[PDB]
Design a protein around this nucleic acid. Sequence first.
DNA 1: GCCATGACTAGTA
DNA 2: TACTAGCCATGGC
Lengths: 164, 161, 164
Amino acid sequence: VHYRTIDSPIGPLTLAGHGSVLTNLRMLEQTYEPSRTHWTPDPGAFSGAVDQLNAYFAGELTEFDVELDLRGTDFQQRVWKALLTIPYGETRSYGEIADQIGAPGAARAVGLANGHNPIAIIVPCHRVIGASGKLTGYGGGINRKRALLELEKSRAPADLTLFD
Amino acid sequence: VHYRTIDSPIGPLTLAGHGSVLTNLRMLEQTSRTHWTPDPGAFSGAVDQLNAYFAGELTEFDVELDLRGTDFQQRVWKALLTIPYGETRSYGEIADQIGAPGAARAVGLANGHNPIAIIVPCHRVIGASGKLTGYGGGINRKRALLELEKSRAPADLTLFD
Amino acid sequence: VHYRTIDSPIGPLTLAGHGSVLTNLRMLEQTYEPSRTHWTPDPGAFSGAVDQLNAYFAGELTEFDVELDLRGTDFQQRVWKALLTIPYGETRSYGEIADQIGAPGAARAVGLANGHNPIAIIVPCHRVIGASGKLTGYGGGINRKRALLELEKSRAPADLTLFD
DNA sequence: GCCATGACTAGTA
DNA sequence: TACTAGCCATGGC
């Protein structure tokens, strides 16, 4: 299992997976770090994705063509699959997904499922929010989530939104 | 408004209201009684029934109620009244039943604010896990009343399980 | 208005008031700063109240003999008055207090009123907790809340509880 | 338009 | 058991 850390406007992102397939995408200081058992530094890895992320922040990207290995509970899976439903710039609520995937009255259970997302950004755990419309939490900081949302309505540098 | 305290297996019940219409029924140490005048001759229709209930004979009250409270509380309480004797529903089920699904916690609090205990069968609402989860005059009373309605016979004893 | 700032196990406390009657008592980085308008420092001030606090933190003093002047809402005064009810070493739920000043349903409301208690220990906003058992929030952080509650529970300095 | 609430509910370690 | 990135109705402010 190979891993690579690139820079970003919200800080270093660390991608990981097998060959060309991402298993992980995490940030600096976000809760629930996976055990990184058998991880190897590979500077040239995930070049496809690495390009695409850079573009995303640069404004020019909206849909992510990448290969993913999502490993986790069928409830967790069913959720995360739904997250990719969510288009660029749009937002859904915790409650709404619990409906979409047919687990009505599981609005909170999603809470956990979002946080155990192993592949941030590309799987958009940041596009899910409270029914009132408030950011309730983010693995890597509530403010970071905010910066990622304010990118997607106005193409505003997360470099900035981040210190508000 | 005029009021009267009586006994029961679970200790003093205070009934209150105006004329023969009942606004409150409160048991001891529960979760503002201004202008209230004690009148030990009142609500005897109600009081009769409340003994019958505890004897395990009455299973359908016949009293006039005055349920002052918020819109959402009315709707809840009114829904409490549809729960038959010796059955039970979840806080969820009620939420659904009043067409405000996913409010069940709120049902909890409306349920908390029942101004008229027992006759409004708020104690028959329970957790979807079957858990008791709390009652105004304590959990042990809740258990007692439920056990009573199950057995159609006094569960005076159940207060000390 | 005089004030005097003294040391304590939970960080320095500042007492203010007129002559010998206490109007405020607050901690560092406490939520809801009041304006210190026309405050002038008096390092000999309130020596009654002081020698009691040292004794309170030594676990010896249990009931404060002190003249207060509280200022706030019709309601806020009801709540704060309800607080001097609570004996050393016991607690009450938020809503429990609500009931006791004849205003059921106002739990979340008593929330704020504590927030705004001008005198922090002597009037024990710290002895008020969520019915869940979990302790909900505190002016100078839960660390400090926890510590005080443990102090009363042990009749013994709990100045490590800050770090638990 | 803010919240230091609470008789809920749903999945994991 | 007991954890939560939730929820909805509140009552002051």
